[PDB]
Design a protein around this ligand. Structure first.
Ligand SMILES: [Cl-]
Ligand SMILES: [Cl-]
Ligand SMILES: [Mg+2]
Ligand SMILES: [Mg+2]
Ligand SMILES: [Mg+2]
Ligand SMILES: [Mg+2]
Ligand SMILES: [Mg+2]
Ligand SMILES: [Mg+2]
Ligand SMILES: [Mg+2]
Ligand SMILES: [Mg+2]
Ligand code: NA
Ligand code: NA
Ligand code: NA
Ligand code: NA
Ligand code: NA
Ligand code: NA
Lengths: 140, 154, 186, 95, 156
RNA sequence: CCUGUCAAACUCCAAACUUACAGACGCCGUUUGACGCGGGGAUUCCGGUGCGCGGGGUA
RNA sequence: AGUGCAAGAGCAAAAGAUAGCUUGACAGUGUUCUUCCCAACGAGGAACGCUGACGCGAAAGCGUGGUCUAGCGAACCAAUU
RNA sequence: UUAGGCGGCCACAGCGGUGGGGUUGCCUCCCGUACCCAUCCCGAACACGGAAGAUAAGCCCACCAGCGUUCCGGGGAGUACUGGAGUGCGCGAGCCUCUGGGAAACCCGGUUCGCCGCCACC
């Protein structure tokens, strides 16, 4: 049963929601790979009327690239609980979000006969705190 | 097999109705025809229901009428037993009548005009403004009801 | 689901199995479809026609019934695909089928992909199919050379037990060679 | 009518019931008919092309050859004979 | 103006406010009267039933309703009863106030279409039918002839 | 939850009925030639009423 | 939601969004429906072909301008190819 | 069909939920990036190569009706409406009789947790 039910880290998105950049540089070094531009939608008063327009960057880290990052990111965070997703996710911080899920997730991401993950096989906030907490730190 | 008798004139009556009476071989007030009880024939008489008088006649009545008002497809010739015999598959009027009612043959198939041009009802009919259930003379009738009319117009 | 006014996708769309917009462009030709499908371990190739109550398969070939002819290698690779294509192609020919269009279903038209391999094979089997030569692999990769060389970077057998150690694109030739004359079910 | 465009008064006939909403199945858009075959004309709200003048929705014509993939269906408008260019998507076999 | 001009239900249903504008406000003050805090938990229930389909202008509704409830103070301002007028004036009515040229009238008011046999008014009382009298007065101000029907009340 | 009402430019529903085509019966046509085709000559393009359904209008 | 604009209608692995590429908003000539139900009537419009030349795509295929119904103009004369 | 591929009809098939199933025909998740190919950044996806592990997802199998849907019984209802007829009624609005058709809401009880086609396959 287990093994194919025990949590795992799938991507850690580190993004800097600026308002117009030179910031990419630090994300590249802080993560280890190129950042991605962040265009925005809708015209607004914060002199942000431009639809297509660089307004920040992000970086999606997977596998070791993600751990090797969290192995310093997490340490710089304290928070826990309430600050957790209903799906077992959590964002802290410059932002650093962590998407957590179980083994058969490719089922909801693939092209062919894709399917959404059943609620039972979904990850709960609790089941999440356990997995991470059980990896160099403390909850709440 | 029902006996159809037109009791209301053509003036003002819908054309699609009038044409039906015409397809059923009736072209004058007081003319009668004998129609089989089929789905097709049912629909037609229902559509004509308000300007006609119909029902199933008794053997005798049909006979009286046939004798009194039947005609060759052409000519004056009186249709009596001898005529019936020397001209039809049957041996006499009753033989013919029975066949009609049992819907085995038709006035045409026997070289007879599909129309029994009856006489006005002696003593008059019950009116052409109300149906039978209302004391009138329009619509479906009792075998006793039809016979009375048919006989009075013999 | 929600109400009377709710609209439920057709079944094969709920299942994410059939792309109906493409299916229509496919049926347009009026020709039989060369259905190229895959699996983690296998590769299927069917020749489908249209029918009163659903499609009709007039000829097929599955990477598994490949061994039935001497295949002693894995069945989810390029050489496998090609051959399965050639196998179905031939059976197809036997069935009186002469032309068909390539239905790669929900797969991507990536160059040198296995579906195109399935297509190259089917064509070589004698089946007439609208294609584009330079979207296909360069014969060698079809043979399975990309894998042989990959095992050159050995240190540990690419194949767990299986057959050989340095693998054999030759085994590929021997098989293609075989399918090109006589034998049962062809 | 306040206007005389083709779609005048076609709000009902050229609209789908909510559940038949969305792309139509390709099976009937590819059906093959033969000259002499009787077919019912009914535009499919979801199929933009291959249509005919709405006035003819409900007619039962007789296929008589085709033009390109579209068929040429003979019908009689009132008392006038007419040839309608229509695709299978908007046709159905009689009986 | 007279009821004569609007009492018949011969014109089309005219109620789409998305296409009609300048519609006068209803004069009907309220629809729930008496102890509306309480629910119909009364022994007796009399209703006023219209006997012919008619159009009743918000004018008459208010005048009929007032006349009845205003009288139901034979029971006192905060007496124990609840009175309901279940109909609402949805039908917009016009007047062509040029002779017959461009005669589509202009909105002048509203009315309620009541079908013969519907009950326009419903009262709820304890064996104390002064309400029967409140209605001899209410159907006095509406076009139709009416029926004063008693429902839960075998206390005769 | 409970409770009070509506729609010519609303519709989860939904007739009667009208309508395309075909079969069947009826009726009609093959000396009274129907259906249809071609040609000659018009008149006519102020209409009205009853009933059913209407839209406008206090009427 | 969006799809340039009335209203009604169409559309979700798209008819919408993003990206990239492209100029089929191409020349020639027709069939058919519409304009004008039935039922004659021009310009205009549309649907659907063919010939030629092209664009994109692995390909089936799609492109006869914009998802559909408005956005239009005779003879004579002039200019233009 | 001891798990497959392509479909037809396109909710009777949807939504939600319970139980069962894999040394193998198998499907998957899964393992992994030298290659074909790939991410405006990530072998996540796509593509390619492969079996150490698993039946927890998916999927296939058996089942539940709470919701949505389909059809049926009984009631609503031969009610509403309506094609044809009337020297029937009514000041009128309108109604009634005869004849031929005939609903919707809602309630109660069943049904429905897909059916079927081709191909392949201990
Ligand atoms: Cl596949
Ligand atoms: Cl047309
Ligand atoms: Mg004679
Ligand atoms: Mg006398
Ligand atoms: Mg009399
Ligand atoms: Mg309408
Ligand atoms: Mg009509
Ligand atoms: Mg277009
Ligand atoms: Mg001039
Ligand atoms: Mg399980
Ligand atoms: Na559709
Ligand atoms: Na004036
Ligand atoms: Na009164
Ligand atoms: Na024209
Ligand atoms: Na950019
Ligand atoms: Na499983």
């Amino acid at each position: 049963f287990h093994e194919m039910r025990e949590p795992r880290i799938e991507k850690v998105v580190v993004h800097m929601g600026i308002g117009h950049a030179n910031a990419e540089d630090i994300l590249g070094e802080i993560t280890g790979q190129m950042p991605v531009r962040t265009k925005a939608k809708r015209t607004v008063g914060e002199f942000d009327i431009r639809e297509g327009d660089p307004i920040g960057a992000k970086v999606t880290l997977r596998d070791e690239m993600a751990e090797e990052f969290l192995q310093t990111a997490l340490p710089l965070a304290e928070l826990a609980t309430s600050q957790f997703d209903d799906t077992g996710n959590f964002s802290f911080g410059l932002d650093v979000t962590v998407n957590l899920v179980r083994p058969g997730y490719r089922v909801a991401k693939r092209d062919k006969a894709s399917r959404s993950i059943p609620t039972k096989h979904r990850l709960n906030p609790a089941d999440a705190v356990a997995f991470i907490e059980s990896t160099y730190d403390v909850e709440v | 097999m029902h006996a159809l008798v037109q009791l209301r004139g053509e003036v003002n009556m819908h054309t699609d109705i009038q044409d039906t009476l015409e397809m059923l071989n009736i072209h004058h007030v007081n003319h009668c025809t004998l129609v089989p009880e089929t789905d097709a024939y049912r629909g037609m008489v229902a559509k004509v229901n308000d300007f006609v008088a119909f029902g199933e006649p008794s053997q005798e009545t049909l006979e009286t009428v046939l004798a009194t008002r039947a005609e060759p497809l052409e000519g004056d010739a009186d249709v009596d037993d001898e005529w019936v015999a020397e001209h039809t598959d049957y041996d006499d009027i009753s033989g013919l009548a029975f066949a009609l009612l049992s819907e085995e043959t038709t006035l045409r198939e026997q070289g007879l005009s599909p129309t029994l041009r009856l006489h006005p009802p002696r003593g008059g009919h019950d009116g052409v403004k109300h149906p039978v259930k209302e004391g009138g003379q329009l619509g479906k009738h009792d075998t006793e009801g039809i016979d009375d009319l048919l006989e009075a117009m013999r | 689901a929600t109400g009377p006014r709710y609209k439920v996708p057709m079944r094969r769309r709920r299942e994410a199995r059939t792309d109906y917009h493409q299916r229509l462009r496919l049926l347009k030709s009026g020709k039989p479809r060369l259905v190229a499908r895959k699996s983690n371990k296998h590769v299927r190739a069917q020749l489908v026609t249209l029918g009163p109550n659903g499609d009709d398969t007039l000829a097929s070939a599955h990477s598994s019934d490949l061994a039935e002819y001497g295949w002693e290698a894995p069945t989810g690779n390029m050489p496998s695909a090609y051959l399965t294509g050639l196998l179905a192609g031939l059976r197809a020919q036997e069935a009186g089928v002469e032309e068909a269009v390539l239905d790669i279903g929900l797969n991507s038209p990536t160059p040198g992909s296995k579906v195109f391999a399935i297509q190259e094979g089917a064509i070589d089997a004698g089946l007439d199919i609208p294609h584009n030569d330079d979207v296909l692999a360069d014969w060698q990769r079809t043979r399975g050379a990309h894998i042989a060389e990959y095992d050159e970077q050995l240190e540990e057998p690419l194949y767990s037990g299986d057959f050989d150690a340095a693998d054999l694109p030759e085994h590929f030739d021997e098989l293609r060679e075989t399918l090109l004359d006589g034998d049962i079910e062809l | 009518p306040s206007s005389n465009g083709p779609l005048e008064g076609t709000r009902g006939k050229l609209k789908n019931k909510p559940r038949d909403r969305g792309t139509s199945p390709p099976q009937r858009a590819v059906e093959e008919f033969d000259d002499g075959e009787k077919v019912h004309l009914k535009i499919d709200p979801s199929v933009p092309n291959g249509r005919f003048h709405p006035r003819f929705d409900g007619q039962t014509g007789t296929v008589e050859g085709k033009q390109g993939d579209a068929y040429k269906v003979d019908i009689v408008d009132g008392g006038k004979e007419k040839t309608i260019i229509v695709t299978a998507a908007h046709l159905r076999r009689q009986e | 103006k007279p009821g004569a001009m609007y009492r018949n239900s011969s014109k089309p249903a005219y109620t789409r406010r998305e296409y009609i504008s300048g519609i006068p406000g209803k004069k009907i003050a309220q629809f729930d009267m008496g102890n509306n805090g309480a629910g119909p938990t009364y022994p007796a229930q009399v209703e006023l039933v219209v006997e012919k389909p008619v159009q009743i202008r918000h004018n008459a509704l208010e005048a009929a309703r007032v006349a009845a409830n205003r009288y139901v103070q034979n029971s006192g301002a905060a007496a124990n009863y609840k009175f309901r007028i279940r109909k609402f004036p949805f039908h917009v009515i016009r007047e062509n106030k040029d002779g017959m040229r461009a005669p589509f009238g202009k909105p002048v008011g509203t009315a309620a279409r009541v079908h013969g046999a519907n009950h326009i008014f419903i009262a709820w009382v304890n064996p104390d039918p002064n309400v029967e009298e409140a209605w001899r007065r209410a159907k006095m101000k509406v076009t139709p002839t009416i029926n004063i029907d008693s429902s839960p009340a075998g206390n005769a």
